[PDB]
């Protein structure tokens, strides 16, 4: 068949329209080239590009048979010669996420402005979560040389409007994600552990000052580690056990790992905290890798030093590429999720770094940003929807 022809049903959706349209097309010399159909709130769109013999396609026979059979049931339909038309659309060059509780129209409208301001076509939009946070995904195509300015744009927009914004490359390698590492304190686990231990030595005050002074990027990580652990010199090492019992998991964390197992992920943690305390919980979670510092003990009591080598900032980036080596996962399929300057070097070495309840020094450099203290929102940023999760969970 010689010449091409584009057909397009619009109108309220109903059953059988897709069948009806193609039986009808069989009666004329018709072979498909592309078919695109969707139903959004019942509005049916259907876009069939065919190429059929110039014989039939120059004839009113086809026109009348289609038009008649569509408008009969209550939908519109258009028919036009094609010849030059692109057969199948290009893929999207980036994907963007917008999340928040709530997402104001002004907020979302600002994202779309700055996206427009740069030449970026919104190729598609859809909602990924209604719980615990409205999240909406946008596949966008970006002018070459703009995407640096894009994340500049979007971060700003995020701050002024109180929504979380996230911009990944939507490419083949970059989307077979396979490896995730979590910080522990204030990411995977609620609270600072070095404060649960501090509070046992009645020095919860001094220590919590320094800790926030560090996680924000004001004191050398080693230097503030020594000094805070210094406060613990004297405690019976039984207290380690006491703090690993009190620990709580970030909300939704179980669901985050359980789902990250589904997609075949290697999951690990990377702290500057204390291996003896993550070692229990990283067993129960059946994690694949733990990199953490060691508390010195003598005759059963804590000396207040840490055993070296210390896992400083750059030690956390080191800590991840070692994992990514041991499991064979290149760096660009590696996910990292932190919450403080401690993690600046991890997130920037990972292929997709995620600031979670981050101090602002982090948000400034993470490829993405979540403000709201639910760890399941990490799933949405990785290609999953609240619908899938509850489906897969519900089957068991
Ligand atoms: Mg932390």
Swiss-Prot record:
Class of enzymatic activity (EC top level): hydrolase
Cofactors, names only: Mg(2+)
Q: Which reaction does it catalyse?
A: O-phospho-L-serine + H2O = L-serine + phosphate; O-phospho-D-serine + H2O = D-serine + phosphate
**Which biological processes are named by the entry's GO terms?**
L-serine biosynthetic process
Protein residues bound to substrate = 192, 228, 271-272, 316, 342
Enumerate the spans annotated as ACT domain.
6-84
The UniProt keyword set, sorted, is:
Amino-acid biosynthesis, Hydrolase, Magnesium, Metal-binding, Serine biosynthesis
- Family that this chain belongs to: Belongs to the HAD-like hydrolase superfamily. SerB family.
Official protein name in the record: Phosphoserine phosphatase
Q: Which organism is it from?
A: Mycobacterium avium (strain 104)
